[PDB]
Amino acid sequence: PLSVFGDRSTGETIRSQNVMAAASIANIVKSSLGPVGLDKMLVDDIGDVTITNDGATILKLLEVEHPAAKVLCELADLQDKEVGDGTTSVVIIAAELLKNADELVKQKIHPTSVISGYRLACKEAVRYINENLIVNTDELGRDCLINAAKTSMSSKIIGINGDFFANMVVDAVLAIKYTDIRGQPRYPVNSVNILKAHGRSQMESMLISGYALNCVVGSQGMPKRIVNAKIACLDFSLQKTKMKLGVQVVITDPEKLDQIRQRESDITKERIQKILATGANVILTTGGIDDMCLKYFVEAGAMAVRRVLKRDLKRIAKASGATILSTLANLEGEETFEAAMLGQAEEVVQERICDDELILIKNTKARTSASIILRGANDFMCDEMERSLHDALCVVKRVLESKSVVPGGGAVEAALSIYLENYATSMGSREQLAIAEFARSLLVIPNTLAVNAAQDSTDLVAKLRAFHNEAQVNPERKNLKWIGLDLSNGKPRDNKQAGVFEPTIVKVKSLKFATEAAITILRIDDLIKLHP
Amino acid sequence: RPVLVLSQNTKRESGRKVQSGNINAAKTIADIIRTCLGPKSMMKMLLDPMGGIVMTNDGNAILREIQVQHPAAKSMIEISRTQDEEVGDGTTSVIILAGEMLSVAEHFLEQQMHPTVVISAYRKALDDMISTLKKISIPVDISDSDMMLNIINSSITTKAISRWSSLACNIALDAVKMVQFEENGRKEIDIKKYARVEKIPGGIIEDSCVLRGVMINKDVTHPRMRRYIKNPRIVLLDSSLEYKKGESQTDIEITREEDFTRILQMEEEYIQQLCEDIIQLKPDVVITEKGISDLAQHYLMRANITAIRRVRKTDNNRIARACGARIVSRPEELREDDVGTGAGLLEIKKIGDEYFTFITDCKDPKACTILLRGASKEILSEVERNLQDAMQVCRNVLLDPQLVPGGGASEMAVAHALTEKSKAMTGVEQWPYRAVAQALEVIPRTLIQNCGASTIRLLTSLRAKHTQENCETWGVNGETGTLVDMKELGIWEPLAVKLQTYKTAVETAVLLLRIDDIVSGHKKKG
Amino acid sequence: MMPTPVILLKEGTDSSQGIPQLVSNISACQVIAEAVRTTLGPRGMDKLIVDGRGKATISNDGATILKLLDVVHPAAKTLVDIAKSQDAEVGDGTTSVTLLAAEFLKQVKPYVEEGLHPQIIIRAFRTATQLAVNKIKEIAVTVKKADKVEQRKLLEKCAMTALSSKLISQQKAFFAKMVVDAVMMLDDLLQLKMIGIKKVQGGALEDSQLVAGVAFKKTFSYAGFEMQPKKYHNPKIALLNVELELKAEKDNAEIRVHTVEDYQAIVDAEWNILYDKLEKIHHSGAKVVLSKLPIGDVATQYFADRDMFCAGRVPEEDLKRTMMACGGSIQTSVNALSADVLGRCQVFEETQIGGERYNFFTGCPKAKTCTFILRGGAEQFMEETERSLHDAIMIVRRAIKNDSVVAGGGAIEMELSKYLRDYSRTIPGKQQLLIGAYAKALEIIPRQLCDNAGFDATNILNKLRARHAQGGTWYGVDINNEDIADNFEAFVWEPAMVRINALTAASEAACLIVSVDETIKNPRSTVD
Amino acid sequence: GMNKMVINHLEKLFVTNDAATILRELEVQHPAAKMIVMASHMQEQEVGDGTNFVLVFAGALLELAEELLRIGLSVSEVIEGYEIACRKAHEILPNLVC
Amino acid sequence: MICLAAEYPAVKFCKVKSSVIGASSQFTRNALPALLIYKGGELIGNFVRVTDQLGDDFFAVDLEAFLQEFGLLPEVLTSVRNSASEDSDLEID
Amino acid sequence: ASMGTLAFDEYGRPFLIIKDQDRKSRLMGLEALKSHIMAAKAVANTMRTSLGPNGLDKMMVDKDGDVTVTNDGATILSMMDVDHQIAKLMVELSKSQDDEIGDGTTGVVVLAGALLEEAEQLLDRGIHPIRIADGYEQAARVAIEHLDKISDSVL
Numbered sequence A: 001p002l003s004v005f006g007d008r009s010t011g012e013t014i015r016s017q018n019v020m021a022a023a024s025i026a027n028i029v030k031s032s033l034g035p036v037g038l039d040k041m042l043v044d045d046i047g048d049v050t051i052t053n054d055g056a057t058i059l060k061l062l063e064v065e066h067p068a069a070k071v072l073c074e075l076a077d078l079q080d081k082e083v084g085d086g087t088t089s090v091v092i093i094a095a096e097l098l099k100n101a102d103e104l105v106k107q108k109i110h111p112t113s114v115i116s117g118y119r120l121a122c123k124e125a126v127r128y129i130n131e132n133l134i135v136n137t138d139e140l141g142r143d144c145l146i147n148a149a150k151t152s153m154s155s156k157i158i159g160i161n162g163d164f165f166a167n168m169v170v171d172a173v174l175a176i177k178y179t180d181i182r183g184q185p186r187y188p189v190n191s192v193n194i195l196k197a198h199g200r201s202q203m204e205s206m207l208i209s210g211y212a213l214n215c216v217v218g219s220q221g222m223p224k225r226i227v228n229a230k231i232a233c234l235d236f237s238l239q240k241t242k243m244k245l246g247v248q249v250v251i252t253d254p255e256k257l258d259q260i261r262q263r264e265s266d267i268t269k270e271r272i273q274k275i276l277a278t279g280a281n282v283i284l285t286t287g288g289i290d291d292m293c294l295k296y297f298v299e300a301g302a303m304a305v306r307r308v309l310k311r312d313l314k315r316i317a318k319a320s321g322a323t324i325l326s327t328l329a330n331l332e333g334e335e336t337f338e339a340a341m342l343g344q345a346e347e348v349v350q351e352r353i354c355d356d357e358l359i360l361i362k363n364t365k366a367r368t369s370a371s372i373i374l375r376g377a378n379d380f381m382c383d384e385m386e387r388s389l390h391d392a393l394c395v396v397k398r399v400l401e402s403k404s405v406v407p408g409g410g411a412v413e414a415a416l417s418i419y420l421e422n423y424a425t426s427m428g429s430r431e432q433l434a435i436a437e438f439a440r441s442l443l444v445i446p447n448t449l450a451v452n453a454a455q456d457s458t459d460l461v462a463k464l465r466a467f468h469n470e471a472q473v474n475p476e477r478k479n480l481k482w483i484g485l486d487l488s489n490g491k492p493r494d495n496k497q498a499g500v501f502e503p504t505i506v507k508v509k510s511l512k513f514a515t516e517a518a519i520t521i522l523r524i525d526d527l528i529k530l531h532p
Numbered sequence B: 001r002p003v004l005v006l007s008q009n010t011k012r013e014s015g016r017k018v019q020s021g022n023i024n025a026a027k028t029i030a031d032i033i034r035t036c037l038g039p040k041s042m043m044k045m046l047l048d049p050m051g052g053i054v055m056t057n058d059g060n061a062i063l064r065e066i067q068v069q070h071p072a073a074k075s076m077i078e079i080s081r082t083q084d085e086e087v088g089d090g091t092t093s094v095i096i097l098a099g100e101m102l103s104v105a106e107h108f109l110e111q112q113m114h115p116t117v118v119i120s121a122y123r124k125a126l127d128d129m130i131s132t133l134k135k136i137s138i139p140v141d142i143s144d145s146d147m148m149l150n151i152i153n154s155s156i157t158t159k160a161i162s163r164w165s166s167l168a169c170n171i172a173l174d175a176v177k178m179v180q181f182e183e184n185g186r187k188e189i190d191i192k193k194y195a196r197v198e199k200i201p202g203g204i205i206e207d208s209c210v211l212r213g214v215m216i217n218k219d220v221t222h223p224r225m226r227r228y229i230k231n232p233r234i235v236l237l238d239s240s241l242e243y244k245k246g247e248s249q250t251d252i253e254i255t256r257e258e259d260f261t262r263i264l265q266m267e268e269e270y271i272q273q274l275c276e277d278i279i280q281l282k283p284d285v286v287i288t289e290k291g292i293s294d295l296a297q298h299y300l301m302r303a304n305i306t307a308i309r310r311v312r313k314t315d316n317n318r319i320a321r322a323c324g325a326r327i328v329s330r331p332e333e334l335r336e337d338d339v340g341t342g343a344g345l346l347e348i349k350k351i352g353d354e355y356f357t358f359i360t361d362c363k364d365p366k367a368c369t370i371l372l373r374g375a376s377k378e379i380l381s382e383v384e385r386n387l388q389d390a391m392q393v394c395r396n397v398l399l400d401p402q403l404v405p406g407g408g409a410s411e412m413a414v415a416h417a418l419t420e421k422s423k424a425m426t427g428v429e430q431w432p433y434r435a436v437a438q439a440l441e442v443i444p445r446t447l448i449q450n451c452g453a454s455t456i457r458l459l460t461s462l463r464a465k466h467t468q469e470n471c472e473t474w475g476v477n478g479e480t481g482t483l484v485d486m487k488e489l490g491i492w493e494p495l496a497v498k499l500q501t502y503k504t505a506v507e508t509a510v511l512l513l514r515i516d517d518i519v520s521g522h523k524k525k526g
Numbered sequence C: 001m002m003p004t005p006v007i008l009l010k011e012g013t014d015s016s017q018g019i020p021q022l023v024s025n026i027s028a029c030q031v032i033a034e035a036v037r038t039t040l041g042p043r044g045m046d047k048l049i050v051d052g053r054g055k056a057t058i059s060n061d062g063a064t065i066l067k068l069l070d071v072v073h074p075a076a077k078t079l080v081d082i083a084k085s086q087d088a089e090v091g092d093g094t095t096s097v098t099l100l101a102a103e104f105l106k107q108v109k110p111y112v113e114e115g116l117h118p119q120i121i122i123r124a125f126r127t128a129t130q131l132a133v134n135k136i137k138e139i140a141v142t143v144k145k146a147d148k149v150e151q152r153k154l155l156e157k158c159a160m161t162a163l164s165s166k167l168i169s170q171q172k173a174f175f176a177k178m179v180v181d182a183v184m185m186l187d188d189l190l191q192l193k194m195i196g197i198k199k200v201q202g203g204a205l206e207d208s209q210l211v212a213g214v215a216f217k218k219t220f221s222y223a224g225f226e227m228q229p230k231k232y233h234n235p236k237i238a239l240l241n242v243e244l245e246l247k248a249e250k251d252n253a254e255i256r257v258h259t260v261e262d263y264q265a266i267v268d269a270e271w272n273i274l275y276d277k278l279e280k281i282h283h284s285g286a287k288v289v290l291s292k293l294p295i296g297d298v299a300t301q302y303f304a305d306r307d308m309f310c311a312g313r314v315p316e317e318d319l320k321r322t323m324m325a326c327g328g329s330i331q332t333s334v335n336a337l338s339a340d341v342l343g344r345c346q347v348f349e350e351t352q353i354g355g356e357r358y359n360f361f362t363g364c365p366k367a368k369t370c371t372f373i374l375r376g377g378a379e380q381f382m383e384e385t386e387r388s389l390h391d392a393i394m395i396v397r398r399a400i401k402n403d404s405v406v407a408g409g410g411a412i413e414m415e416l417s418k419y420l421r422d423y424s425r426t427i428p429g430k431q432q433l434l435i436g437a438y439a440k441a442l443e444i445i446p447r448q449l450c451d452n453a454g455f456d457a458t459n460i461l462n463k464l465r466a467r468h469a470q471g472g473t474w475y476g477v478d479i480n481n482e483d484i485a486d487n488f489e490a491f492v493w494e495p496a497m498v499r500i501n502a503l504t505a506a507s508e509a510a511c512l513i514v515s516v517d518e519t520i521k522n523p524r525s526t527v528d
Numbered sequence D: 001g002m003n004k005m006v007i008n009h010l011e012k013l014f015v016t017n018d019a020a021t022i023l024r025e026l027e028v029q030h031p032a033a034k035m036i037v038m039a040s041h042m043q044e045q046e047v048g049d050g051t052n053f054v055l056v057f058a059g060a061l062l063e064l065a066e067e068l069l070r071i072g073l074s075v076s077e078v079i080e081g082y083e084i085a086c087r088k089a090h091e092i093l094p095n096l097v098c
Numbered sequence E: 001m002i003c004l005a006a007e008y009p010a011v012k013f014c015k016v017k018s019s020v021i022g023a024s025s026q027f028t029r030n031a032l033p034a035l036l037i038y039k040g041g042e043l044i045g046n047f048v049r050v051t052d053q054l055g056d057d058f059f060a061v062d063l064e065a066f067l068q069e070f071g072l073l074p075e076v077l078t079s080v081r082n083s084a085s086e087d088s089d090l091e092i093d
Numbered sequence F: 001a002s003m004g005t006l007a008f009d010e011y012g013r014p015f016l017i018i019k020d021q022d023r024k025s026r027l028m029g030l031e032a033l034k035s036h037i038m039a040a041k042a043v044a045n046t047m048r049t050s051l052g053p054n055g056l057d058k059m060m061v062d063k064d065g066d067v068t069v070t071n072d073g074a075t076i077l078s079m080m081d082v083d084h085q086i087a088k089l090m091v092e093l094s095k096s097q098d099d100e101i102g103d104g105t106t107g108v109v110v111l112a113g114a115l116l117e118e119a120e121q122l123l124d125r126g127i128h129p130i131r132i133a134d135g136y137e138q139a140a141r142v143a144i145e146h147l148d149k150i151s152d153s154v155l
């Protein structure tokens, strides 16, 4: 009849297939949630190993075929990009929402009503979180940042080492702090250059009060350390001058060839002399430096580094006050290098790190920067440390930007479930079932934590729900809103007092993204797969 | 036809089976090199896929030649490489320790204890191990050359070079001492770049020595060059001494008759000008990283100057360090400072059927060449590996002068101290703590096993001995299987090596304990 | 894992353990349930299954559909086996048992996923099932008068309720009355083999008839058969197990003669043996001769010459039915054909039914057997009519055993669910969730009825729950009026044994599936 | 204990928690495991119950024997100690009758 | 090829069984040494039967020079790794 | 819309329910009814041309090449080499009509085809098929009663 070249799935078949794919994706990463979660080994059939706990990384490395599973993977990636934390919780919540919504649909509830109920439940959950479950960080102080970093780094390779890594992360984030127009203190994470190097233990990871370059001097002749550095950042190569494409040298008088060839390098000689005549000590350029220019720097006792990365050069110039010069051309058509185009640093040292060397630009003036050197046991451990450290930095940035945090350990999810279950009776007649199922699906996070802890998930979640119900029914028991889970002892615990925090933005964005993904997948009721 | 969530070739397994497999793979890696520890260790023969042969008893050298499929074994091999690169010694010890801790962790994982608790106990035990090691250490006077030689000897008693111990110790100590540099308030040793080991098969091993300078495998460019100069003045260059094209396209247009001859004469005159610029400094030896033209050779030789060409950049840097010269790219910028005075002799002599250039009488040189002469290539490779281990140990001691008793004494003392500490925790994580504390006894155990003595009786006697007050230095004699105090046997290790071994082993155990799922088969997607 | 140079089990052995395999087992049970999901209720639909050889089977019976499916999943085969058990013990409820068991498993799946110990689930299932069975026995309606009219009406209503889901639901009253009439003439054992079912192609469904006696197809008549009269007004039937034709006297017999006179004497002796048997049969006074063994042409002509009727090679069960109805005795020896070993019937007749000839033995006052002659348009039509009649017959037999009835249409399930929820609201709470899940799973039957009828399941379930909460034990789904109604007063009656067995079997299957933790599949042997 | 679905080479499905039946329907190939299975079957034939006890005790004994061999004992010493301890256990057992 | 891949990160040396592709009898009898070179999606080097021009136990340098005979070879050591949104840095503004 | 339910798991482990489930097709719901109605319509439209005094013969060839020119509907459908199950049902319908009556074995096929053609457009409007069957049965009872009413006896 149709005569279309492909397969067709219609009705409950395609819906069940989509829910199966989402559930499989959720079960892939369900075992890596919460402090009692465990990492995963990923092998790419070539011999490369990626030990990771990040949900976004796991879903990115895996090659997936089903479109709904791809939707969940992109959801995790988007959560990672826009927040930096909660990449596993968003996927689990979205899959649970999809499963419960499909159960409702199989109960002959129209998907439009389910979608409307889900949207209303998401709005009410966000409003309730922003009205009741937020804790202002103004009165908490640096302890709030430390606790947020420790909570973020739990369930990672740097978990128990939180007492030290949280201080390190907070110091780095505060170091890279800057303010802009509209009076907003903006924290540009990814300005912290994360350098990995196996060797000593995690305790030997260093927080550089400056910047760290994964580069060395171009020649062994130059000194490896300069005290009062005058950093000169350049964006052009220092090589023998070559005529451009449109210029060709044609010789008719033999006497001029030697002069031509001499000036061919005298041009670069003069440029280097102009640069060095102002007292520059450290010269960083993105382009290459050949042997003759390297010797020019050697004789003057300078420090020349070639093939410096563009982002690294920009960060060094911004921190040290130097201006990146793509050319030595001024507004008078001349070749000049003013002294004001020089950066300043308190030291530039080429340190040795496990039979390898890197350049440390220490204590730059006019701006404070930061870099991190992660010391581990092998490359895989260093990569996992870097991923966890990036997660912690993102969490600290979120806490510092928006001054609201919420208790962790499933407390917010349980409170939301209780409130939405109570609220569903006040809206609609058929979408109330959708709101109730949204509330029930919100309970998948504490259940997953308890399951990962190998404790009595049913009884523990029942106790948590009872605590939150008592909090929401009795006006005088508002202090019970912070009751979460203590996974080590398997008992409910006041997480706000215990120091388990996370940014409100993480929960809000995860809820919104999961609701949108569930709505998107729920609309599909007929799939046509054309034959390639 | 089929529809799947993941790819067809994506295979996933999880649960207790993954942990058991990881721990079994680690134990297998440890068992591979278990018998290669101690003064009585036996060598191994490795066949390279390229046809070469590696005959050694070093942990890293053995492990880097093994190709494995289990990612846990890959992690263990990376651990071996990390230990070798960071400190240069203790490569077998860290692997054995990691295997033992993973076994004693598997014991607890069989029960209902979560891996995170075991990891926390391991971290606490690692901190206590660091504390105990720092406590039981002793200082070393680096000025005393005899003590340094004894330390190097204790480092190389377990290798194939131990039969020539005084010679190897003196070679390593002299190389490390004279490669030491301190410029601009920065102290560096730099064994990797300078202090190159050059091996020539043949001769006898006792003829090996460390030179007060640099030896390279090069010969003079012309026969009439002098092959023996008493007190040469050496100039080093990068740029070629030959006429070369420019960067820009520079085609000529000849219309007059004499223009071709004039171009050729200008080329010759440019070569002569470069050679005159070189000669104006009045040197005796010219070394170039690139080619030297025949006309340039003639013009240099007219001034009685020996020229060597096509030398590697690393060799040129080593020569500059040794003879106190400075590499100059453009000859017209040569100064009196750039000329390297300090070499006390230069000689190009014939070894076997090949010429070698010697600069071997430098005064206060900052670079050296170790001349190894042995039975064959494989023997010389093993000797070079042992010398590298000795020099790494010497550098570690020079950087940190702390010293630690060897032969299992330090490990037994640390285990006893950790057990005494565990006698007071009274918690639920005390059992993994005590287990990983007692897991340190594997290396005294394997020392006894390799010695061939009875493991149980000797281990019980040593454990009883360490329960006394002042018995931290009581270890096992590696070649007689007897309990001997190590302030008499003299076997001691640098503190840095022990610290790195413990940290790396415990962190490997933590990393492999934190994993309970393995997914494989997916494409790189790049 | 490690290669382990020598391994424990044979290569190819597959082992799946833990929560994932239990979840997969529940999913497989769901997949089996949805195969027969749409065959339940008066709005149910038939399913067509084609075998490897191309033969097609069209059925509404759940057990038949499950059997025709080549199910190989170890956990899923349990549902097929319990459907077979339900068909064997009762004969009705084959679709309900699978749905109930799958709904139990689906309702307890969320608790399984979160690490609940399966023993708690098993204990909760056992307790809930015991309470539900006791409640069914308590609230089941029985009449303590044994009035023949009342029992007749009860059996007819039960048969109508059983039949009102098949392709013969339009004529459910006709077939129900016929089935009750057929069953009541069985004496004490209610043997199925005493109710013959004949399928004759061609004819309307209403053309099917119940014979107060025995009827069977004509069986390969010989020459001279058409001479025999085909109607008798008071025949005596000679039921025989005898081969009436010329043949060797014995397999190992051998005749040795040396004179032509002895040759002729032997030939005459064989002929005289045959004629002596025939003459004894004739002198017995019988007019209809039935033999399990073949009757030869000579005997056929002999009986035709005497205005007698003969029919050899009769199927053995048909001769048993004839003996039970007419009231004779099967004789292997014709030497003593007394008057008490000859059957009697008012009318014997051979008539054409849809292009086939059937012998009729009607008018038997002491008949204890029956014969259904089903008329249909094809083989599968008649086979499905026979299956529906078998369901009705088993229901009527069970109702004869005990006249305990409950209202259908999900009314009993709603009452049980309400009772179980009320009970579960008075226990500490670990069992409360599981018993509540059991009670909710009991709601599948009315929901499936509404879904099959194209209804709005949620509204009908809400109305039924509200009704049962405030009173009314027998309120169920009313398919015709798109509403709920008192099913007991609508004569939607089922024996309580059907629901009792359904609940017991579903609970046992669910407990057996839940109790498993690991599945091991050994490598196949002799695949060829 | 939990029932196990065991499918042999003939598509015959066994669900049970009886150790002897599980071992019987399992295609055990390792000779040492075959020996322990033979011991369990002999226990089933002699008494009829206790097969799982036999299997568990043998496994624990062999694991601890592996540990003893690893710490530095000999096979003969472990065997002699096991025999002495088994004799002591058989002596103690009658006193434990309640 | 192992040594070449170790030294050369750009090139994509790969191996495949002759029978898996499904070569003919002549290829399987006298064309086992085959060097298939791809560039731009099309062949630029199609060496087969290289034993005579290479040997039997040749070294890495020998095959490298053989490949270099037709100009087939395109023209520091980090610690372990360096590569860690687009917000880079600002200052006061 | 075939191969049963092609999932193969929820977790990743093998999920095999029915033997050879990867080589078995399945049609559900309204699509199966549409296919059956279309098949019966094709059979009836083929058969309707041989109806009446002006009907044209059909010329069958069996698997051995033998030729059978005939107008008998039951004979035409019996020798037809069909594979669709609904076509086999229609052939058996004709055989039943031939067995019971012996005449009108073609009118039954056309009547069934027309009934299913009308049922197709009735199903397109959302009527449950059982309602269509019940209405057809009621109308058939009415038609049979009318036929009995307008019947005439002969000597």
Ligand SMILES: Nc1ncnc2c1ncn2[C@@H]1O[C@H](COP(=O)(O)OP(=O)(O)O)[C@@H](O)[C@H]1O
Pocket (backbone or CB within 6 Å): A032, A033, A034, A035, A053, A054, A055, A084, A085, A086, A087, A088, A089, A090, A151, A152, A154, A155, A407, A408, A409, A410, A445, A449, A485, A486, A487, A500, A502
């Ligand atoms: N110390 C703790 N106690 C209880 N719960 C915690 C603790 N630390 C983190 N959690 C909870 O564990 C959950 C899982 O976080 P995780 O999976 O590590 O983050 P992500 O989802 O970004 O990977 C978080 O929602 C958090 O609330």
Ligand SMILES: Nc1ncnc2c1ncn2[C@@H]1O[C@H](COP(=O)(O)OP(=O)(O)O)[C@@H](O)[C@H]1O
Pocket (backbone or CB within 6 Å): B036, B037, B038, B039, B041, B059, B089, B090, B091, B092, B093, B094, B154, B157, B158, B405, B406, B407, B408, B447, B476, B477, B478, B479, B491, B493
């Ligand atoms: N004479 C000796 N007696 C006892 N133990 C020794 C002696 N010499 C060395 N050892 C021990 O042997 C170990 C060195 O073994 P080695 O083969 O170097 O393995 P690794 O490379 O892992 O250190 C040291 O830990 C030291 O304590």
Ligand SMILES: Nc1ncnc2c1ncn2[C@@H]1O[C@H](COP(=O)(O)OP(=O)(O)O)[C@@H](O)[C@H]1O
Pocket (backbone or CB within 6 Å): C039, C040, C041, C042, C044, C062, C092, C093, C094, C095, C096, C161, C162, C163, C164, C165, C166, C407, C408, C409, C410, C445, C449, C477, C478, C479, C492
């Ligand atoms: N007239 C009716 N009205 C409502 N429901 C009915 C009616 N007749 C039967 N049922 C329901 O149909 C179900 C049984 O359907 P059926 O397919 O006939 O037998 P099975 O129990 O094998 O599925 C019973 O649960 C009964 O409640």
Ligand SMILES: [Mg+2]
Pocket (backbone or CB within 6 Å): A085, A086, A152, A391
């Ligand atoms: Mg996190």
Ligand SMILES: [Mg+2]
Pocket (backbone or CB within 6 Å): B089, B090, B155, B158, B389
């Ligand atoms: Mg050593």
Ligand SMILES: [Mg+2]
Pocket (backbone or CB within 6 Å): C092, C093, C161, C162, C163, C165, C391
């Ligand atoms: Mg029924």
Ligand SMILES: [Mg+2]
Pocket (backbone or CB within 6 Å): D049, D050, D051
């Ligand atoms: Mg027992």
Ligand SMILES: [Mg+2]
Pocket (backbone or CB within 6 Å): F103, F104
């Ligand atoms: Mg006609």
